Design a protein around this ligand. Structure first.
Ligand SMILES: Nc1ncnc2c1ncn2[C@@H]1O[C@H](COP(=O)(O)OP(=O)(O)OP(=O)(O)O)[C@@H](O)[C@H]1O
Ligand SMILES: Nc1ncnc2c1ncn2[C@@H]1O[C@H](COP(=O)(O)OP(=O)(O)OP(=O)(O)O)[C@@H](O)[C@H]1O
Ligand SMILES: [Mg+2]
Ligand SMILES: [Mg+2]
Lengths: 246, 97, 49, 198, 233, 148, 84, 49, 212, 49
């Protein structure tokens, strides 16, 4: 009872957004503005925070919606700005625990358009502190200063009861998200990540997805172990004997 | 048979005209504009079923006038109530014209 | 069943955890004499499977 | 350059064989486990590869794969005989419901011979063997020989699988549907198949 | 041996069919243009149905192939499967793998998507045979099917008092007409599932929260002005 | 010089249209209506009448745009009904000559969902004749029939 | 292309000009205004489609409604006009 | 290609990739002079091979 | 790195298979056509990627071979994935005669253009006319109807050799044609001055030729 | 390359003392002659010459 909810989405130092927070609706949130205003950019932020995997992330244009890989550009680099950038989600579980999950983004310098990404998670934050406040310093200048992960870790560790966890692999990050009930399935392996991303991006562009249609049984049916493990154990004596003979 | 016809209504265009004329003064005097107060005062002039459209159009007209310098402070704005039955608005005050 | 209720249920059902549900228990009465090949303590329960 | 997955696909050891087969006109059904799986995996690229030859790679709604040449085909084309389509439509008819109980999926040459003789009209039979023929034993023997010959051609197409022994008994694959009729909402397959055979 | 394996396979198949049938009912009477319903059609392949029946009832005819200790059980399953439907070929793959394939229940099921279009009956959903809006609506339907299935799958590994969040997107939502959007809102509301939709102002859904965006140049830099409205209705 | 213009488009016995004629505009013509109304179908009829090359015509959904798919079905057959069908254009030449181009379309009986096309052209037709009436015969009490 | 064929064509014929655009709703008002002025300056005809009437004050418009009727389908077409 | 790209709208991948072929027209005066040199260069190819 | 052409295929081979000339050439080659120096496009292509093509076709159990005269062709192995066939003895008679015609400096002044009648006249000048007539009809004894039948069979076989690429007809006149170097394969039994039996054995061992 | 081919030995040998143009370069383009990296096929593109 009392399903969890996404509460807000925050962007820091993205193209066109220095510091912006969207308060998400319980049922429907509608983004509205003229062409080129930045709507698809916000959805790009959401999904990249959700699935921080640079092998899968590919924000092709809505026209040419279904074509091949084509270019080597994944379309993400141009949405960032020079310096440090963030994307964070705020979630409320059925337990009513406030958890903040996000990633830190930075443009890697070079000829090519590449990006560096690092996930992180915070628990136990008071309800009185907003993400934008955590990630910026109100220096004397007209515009605040975005503070890197070192300053952020120092700032958070000072708080009482607040825990800051910084991940080294995507697998750990997804494991924690599943344990807290932020996603419906724990992404064991890269294949699971690929299918989850297929789901999200198919929803994003719309239409009867070709890939979902091809592998329908792979998506809709759970795999059952009961039928198998009996026979793996019964088969074991023969397997060992055969291997020994070889 | 022969083709029939149907016609559009211009009520919303008229509404836009009244709102833009009413709002032009703020720019001319460069007076700070607060969406909360303006929406609360302006919704009182129409019945409830039409409030949503009035709010949308008023926001469309207001955003063209300058920017709010507070947006760069890193401090989110609050959700102000603008009528009974529970409608809310979020916007910083417009300062830079 | 979930991991949280698993210990509770295992304590509740005790030795009978691995019994069989059979809604009448009188239909077994004729079959029973034939059971010479079974665990030394067999548990039977009545209810809708 | 060349798409990576296309290069992978045609690098696979199974490709030469399948290529050879397909160019011949063979149909790949669900029976050929490995070939069918290979096509399922690399269809998106194989279609493009064969389009370069002005030849179309089609997956039938039933599930089997096959090639269809255009008028500008780069592959030399060839065409079946009238008797060939007659036999094909007969096999499509034999893919019936009582078949399961009648033969358990395994037929004999005699079933087809007698069905063909019983269901077709005499005039087109004479046109098949020779117009000068008239209801004679030698004509029937020649027609039997021609039936065996065309049945072997169809086996080459993959329509029919002979059971591995010298005797002429076989099973019908799903790909035989290619000879079949158009299906409309609620229409009975037996009736429509017979309507075309008539 | 034999019958008991067939029974566990049959029960697994039956449970999957029933769960699908339950999911199927939530999608009745969804209006998307001329589409009026969506289904997941589940069927059993013949070549496996006969195998399952044989393994159930004709085991005395094949026991030689099952109790021969020179080969394992999965190999026995593969050999029996080749004995039936002899026309099947094997791609030089180990019989062990084919056996394990026969052990996996999913391989016995055939799956399709069908739509109840207009005056016609139930038709297989082909993209080329639908308008744009109908295609979008059908896609959303199948996606909620997947999400419900995944939640049912994982709940045996989750806490008793945890209910995961559910959220989906829609870009260029202007492609849907008011009736279709009403249908989509009804679905998501009944499914407790959140939505984020983008449209160039053409649509103004009264329920939910709305954000107005305007991009400007300020101090020779690109800047996005944002305003929000909510609570109407 | 006065540039030529397209006057109108006519559809006969298409999926949902029995005999309908759209009068085009000098600058812009808009089609509106809920999903599935038949707008894209009208587009398809126009382009078919313009380039009847059946090797090229391929009507994908608007979604999946730009994906070279080789789909089993080009999507034209289903937009036609049983029997004979037409699609025609009326054009005013720079020389102020009225010319009517078009095609006769017809489904092919058989398992393959194939289509037949036969182009045609008419010159010198009097200005008072409408294509809708020219292509149909009035049989019965206002219950016209199409003619091959 | 029109310039290339200037030599082959007779002097007195200028060929017709026409283009399409489906799902016009993806464009906002400013973009459509730009598109209209471009095409009218070039004497270019356009045919556009959208679920909702995105162009109320320019050109002609038709509204299509599909009715299920006696176990078949029929399309009803009615025109729209800028002012009433 | 032109009409289909217009119908579905947007930057058509095929159009841009071969833009030379679509925009630049062909000239017969160039060909008439190049016929002679074409013969010569063909001959040279022959020899080379 | 991963997802890199080199993982599965050499770059030059992929570059060749992606060329616009490949499908034509492939199709033709499989059909048995020989490739000489005159069809530049094809020949040049062949030359550029020789080893890749050889390696490729090897997959099929077929040798892509290059004769000394500079012409390419396909020779299937016993285990070939592609069927193999043999020419008729009349084709050989016309083949060896076309070969002698190519060599003949006496007719080089024609600039390669020969007429069916000249070919026929040369053939009857060398071979046993009345004994060769046995192949046209078992009852032939020099009758004109049978002589015309022989000429028509020659006309037919010559057309088959054209499909194999061994001879090219003139663009507007079908009674005249031009030779190509591919005809030298008909001399494979005598190009070395050695024992004919041993040569023949060597050829059958190499898969070049079968007896009848 | 057009300058290289256009201007010939006897008159322009006094012009050829520039570092960019020489005769041998026409044969150096023999390397480019064999196969350029063309992608899409229609009509007939072949080589640098
Ligand atoms: N990778 C990129 N590189 C450079 N500019 C970009 C990139 N992605 C987006 N932009 C620009 O950012 C601005 C916002 O783009 P975006 O796709 O978010 O617009 P939008 O509001 O979603 O528009 P629409 O709904 O009409 O598609 C536009 O000017 C776009 O040109
Ligand atoms: N090939 C086809 N076979 C069967 N039905 C078809 C086919 N093509 C279109 N239809 C149906 O015809 C009706 C009209 O479709 P169409 O795409 O023309 O409508 P539309 O008004 O343009 O819709 P949208 O704006 O959503 O694209 C819809 O019900 C569609 O399902
Ligand atoms: Mg966008
Ligand atoms: Mg449409």
């Amino acid at each position: 009872i009392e399903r969890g909810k996404f509460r807000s989405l925050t962007l820091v130092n993205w193209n066109g957004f220095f510091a912006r927070t969207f308060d998400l609706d319980e049922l429907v949130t509608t983004l509205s503005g003229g062409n080129g205003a930045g709507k698809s950019t916000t959805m790009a932020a959401f999904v990249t925070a959700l699935i921080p995997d640079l092998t899968l992330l590919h924000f092709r244009n809505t026209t040419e919606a279904g074509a091949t890989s084509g270019s080597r550009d994944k379309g993400l680099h141009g949405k960032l700005r020079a310096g440090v950038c963030y994307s964070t989600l705020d979630v409320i579980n059925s337990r009513h625990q406030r958890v903040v999950v996000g990633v830190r983004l930075q443009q890697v310098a070079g000829r090519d358009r590449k990006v560096d990404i690092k996930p992180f998670m915070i628990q136990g934050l008071p309800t009185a502190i907003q993400p934008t406040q955590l990630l910026t310093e109100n220096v004397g200048e007209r515009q605040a200063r975005v503070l890197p992960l070192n300053e952020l870790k120092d700032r958070l560790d000072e708080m009482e009861g607040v825990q800051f966890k910084q991940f080294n692999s995507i697998t750990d990050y997804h494991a924690q998200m599943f344990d807290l009930g932020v996603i419906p399935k724990r992404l064991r392996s890269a294949s699971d990540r690929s299918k989850f991303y297929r789901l999200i991006e198919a929803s994003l562009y719309g239409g009867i997805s070709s890939a979902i249609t091809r592998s329908l049984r792979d998506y809709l049916l759970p795999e059952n172990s009961g039928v198998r493990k009996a026979f793996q154990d019964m088969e074991a004596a023969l397997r060992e004997n055969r291997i020994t003979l070889e | 048979l022969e083709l029939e016809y149907e016609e559009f209504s211009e009520i919303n265009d008229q509404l836009a005209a009244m709102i833009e004329k009413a709002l032009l003064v703020y720019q001319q005097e460069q007076r700070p504009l607060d969406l909360g107060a303006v929406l609360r005062d302006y919704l009182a002039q129409h019945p409830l079923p039409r409030h949503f459209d009035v709010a949308r159009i008023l926001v469309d007209q207001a955003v063209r006038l300058g920017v709010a310098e507070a947006d760069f402070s890193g401090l989110p704005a609050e959700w102000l109530a603008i009528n009974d039955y529970g409608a809310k608005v979020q916007a910083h005050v417009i300062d830079t014209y | 069943i979930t991991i949280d209720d698993a210990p509770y249920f295992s304590a509740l059902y005790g030795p009978a955890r691995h019994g069989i549900v059979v809604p009448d228990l009188s239909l077994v009465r004729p079959h029973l004499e034939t059971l010479e090949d079974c665990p030394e303590d067999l548990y039977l329960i009545e209810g809708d499977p | 350059f060349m798409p990576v997955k296309l290069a992978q696909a045609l690098a696979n050891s199974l490709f030469p064989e399948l290529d050879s087969q397909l160019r011949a006109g063979r149909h790949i059904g669900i029976d050929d486990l490995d070939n069918h799986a290979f096509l399922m995996d690399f269809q998106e690229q194989l279609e493009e590869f064969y389009a370069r030859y002005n030849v179309e790679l089609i997956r039938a709604p039933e599930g089997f794969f096959y090639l269809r040449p255009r008028s500008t085909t780069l592959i030399p084309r060839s065409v079946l005989s009238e008797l060939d389509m007659m036999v094909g439509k007969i096999l499509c008819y034999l893919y019936l419901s009582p078949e399961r109980l009648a033969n358990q999926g395994i037929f004999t040459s005699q079933e087809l011979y007698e069905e063909l003789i019983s269901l077709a009209d005499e005039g087109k039979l004479m046109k098949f063997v020779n117009q000068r023929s008239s209801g004679s034993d030698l004509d029937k023997q020649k027609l039997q020989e021609k039936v065996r010959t065309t049945l072997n051609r169809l086996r080459r197409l993959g329509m029919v699988y002979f059971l591995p022994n010298n005797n002429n008994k076989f099973t019908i694959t799903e790909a035989v549907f290619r000879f079949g009729a158009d299906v409309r909402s609620g229409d009975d397959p037996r009736e429509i198949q017979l309507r075309m055979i008539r | 041996s034999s019958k008991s394996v067939a029974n566990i396979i049959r029960k697994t198949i039956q449970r999957e069919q029933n769960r699908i049938r339950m999911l199927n009912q939530g999608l009745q009477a969804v209006s998307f243009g001329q589409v009026r319903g969506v289904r997941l059609n589940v069927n059993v392949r013949e070549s496996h149905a006969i195998l399952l029946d044989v393994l159930s009832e004709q085991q005395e005819q094949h026991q030689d192939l099952f109790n021969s200790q020179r080969l394992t059980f999965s190999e026995a399953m593969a050999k029996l499967y080749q004995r039936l439907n002899p026309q099947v070929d094997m791609g030089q793959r180990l019989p062990q793998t084919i056996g394990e394939e026969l052990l996996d229940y999913r391989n016995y099921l055939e799956l399709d998507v069908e739509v109840n279009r207009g005056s016609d009956g139930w038709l297989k959903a082909e993209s080329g045979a639908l308008s744009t809006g109908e295609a979008i609506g059908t896609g959303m339907s199948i996606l909620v099917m997947v999400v419900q299935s995944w939640e049912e799958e994982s709940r045996r590994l989750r806490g008793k008092d945890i209910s995961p969040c559910r959220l989906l997107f829609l870009d260029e939502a202007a492609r849907l007409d008011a009736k279709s959007i009403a249908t989509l809102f009804e679905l998501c509301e009944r499914l407790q599932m959140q939505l984020i939709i983008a449209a160039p102002e053409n649509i103004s859904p009264e329920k939910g929260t709305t954000y107005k965006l305007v991009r400007k140049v300020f101090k020779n830099h690109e800047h996005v002005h944002v305003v929000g409205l909510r609570g109407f209705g």
